[model samples]
Target: SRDVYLSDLDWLNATHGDDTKSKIVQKNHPFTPGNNNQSTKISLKMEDGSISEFEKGLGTIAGSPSTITYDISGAGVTKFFSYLGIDRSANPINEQYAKVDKIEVVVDGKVIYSTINQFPNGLTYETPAIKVDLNIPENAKRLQLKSYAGEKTWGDEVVYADAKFTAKGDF
Candidate 1:
């Protein structure tokens, strides 16, 4: 297993806020609703045993893909792990949840892993959480994640919570 710290990496691109404003969060914080909006209350707990009062994970806009990349040449990274789901805190009403159409992983410009219609049946506030594990390529120098949004227009914030990479040997 690889040992990589989540704080050491860089986030190349991601959605940081809802439709109207940008809301950034730190680790172990909590998410709170704004103006009584239901979508403002959703948040994630870090894998390190901390919860956030705000949206601290990576997310995508309503119609665009949320991308995250890493440089791992000679880094011995072999795997990746993260919890994925819709951010219920961004929902204006309880009638809908975030939706994800696809999740793709690219290594060195080649798509090595992908899943379409990740939430084909649609997700709700009560939907079970999902975790993803991806195997890294031997020659992988760069890693890219592309998370696409679903069809619904309102709840389209696809989130990646506590996303991290794993290295094989050595520190």
Candidate 2:
């Protein structure tokens, strides 16, 4: 059914924690263990190749996190669309801001999408989300996301969360 989605069972034992510990704590809940697994913790570099930000915000969002290589083998997908969403929020001064400048998506060291402008010149710093769609070739496997800049509020940067990629196909 199209309504069904992939379960986090594979991510249960490994991505979360040990089965014994999880059973004792909470059978189906997610766990990372220790204070080291804090969210909003990030170390980002500016567009000028300078290290600008290094800190965690007050939330559980993965700050500008990247994903490992995903294998698309035997998925019956001839072509698909990759969505890149960028979002930002306003400060107490009510001033608008732009966090993410440009993004480059690379697959197996080959530049597929280069320097794609995701944000406008001067957009409001709200919970606005921007989505970028790119064609996914059948032979493509790995992916790498490169951010050009961040907002100055958090050293010209912001938090990144709720990222996902889905492949559509006929039954």
Candidate 3:
């Protein structure tokens, strides 16, 4: 994880954070699409008594793996997952849990990527290098990674992850 200073970062004026917080959510990330081998995770920072909800959507691009989990807990300090532009799918082609081996979010250690596993009795933990778009170029200014876990049917989970231009470049 690298440190990125969000100089142009704008916070949405509302008790609820902003659009980024509202759109991004937490869902399970399976080890593979069609196989429920592992459990997905969700982590977020919240006030004393904050209740949050999330929606689902599909990946706009093809061959993109969904993130194992996202920071959709809705905290104020940093809208972690909200600003990245990745979330559940509205019309997913495959709505099943996908495998996400590892993830990380580093901001001078100010921001750390955490985890929440739901497979072996459900647990919340932390990790590094969040499962974002892998195809992004090393020199690319900005990139967007989208994924769809289909639906919350018997065994489906949707997720997304994107890198902001300003955050990466500035960092």
Candidate 4:
């Protein structure tokens, strides 16, 4: 249970699209964390066909490719893990559904984990989550969470839910 949540840190530099300057992700940025007054909770189906709810993470409803960068130079986390999925609230009626074009994780300039098209097979407004877990190299200084959207992606939202880094616990 040893974990260092990304939401606990300050100065999250995120870029939505066609921007060189950095933007900040607020502490209670939507469904990321600290904003629990939501009338509707954020929940998604996993690859294992199980639904899970998250309280800490960040997301993007970007029309173009987006990236969220975190600098954990000495935060003491040695691993990275999270679930990549789309928020079900986008189409509560289960009539229309949107999916992520692709998602990837970059650690200190190295691409370690990625997935192909994440479009859901059915039209029930439900897609399974993609699991991301990687060992963070001690020399690693930066971690980037990047995601892409299909055409008209801004119509919905996709995210790295509960995304965080962790250190090994004592035995």
Q: Which candidate leads the pack in lDDT?
A: 4
lDDT of 2 by residue, 1-171 (tens): 121112211111111112232222111111121123434222223334333222211111111322223344434333323222222221224342334454455565676764344454522233243333556566554544444443432222322222233454422
Local lDDT at 154 for model 4? 40
Rank order (by lDDT, best first): 4, 1, 2, 3
Assess the local accuracy of residue 104 in candidate 3 as a C-alpha lDDT between 0 and 100. Answer: 30
- Which prediction has the highest TM-score against the true structure? 4
TM-score of each: 0.63, 0.39, 0.22, 0.72
Q: What is the clash tally of candidate 2? A: 7
- lDDT of each residue in 16-67, candidate 4, tens digit only: 5323233333232333222334545456787778777777766555435677
Q: Judged by lDDT against the true structure, how good is candidate 4? A: 0.60
Checking candidate 2 for backbone clashes, the offending pairs are: 89-125, 90-125, 150-156, 150-157, 151-156, 151-157, 152-156
Clash count list over all predictions: 14, 7, 23, 0
What is the alpha-carbon RMSD of candidate 1 to the true structure?
5.9
Better model by lDDT: candidate 3 vs candidate 4: 4
lDDT of each: 0.56, 0.32, 0.25, 0.60
CA-only RMSD, every prediction: 5.9, 11.6, 14.2, 5.2
Q: What TM-score does candidate 1 get on C-alpha atoms?
A: 0.63
Q: Residue 16 deviation, candidate 1, in Å? A: 6.9
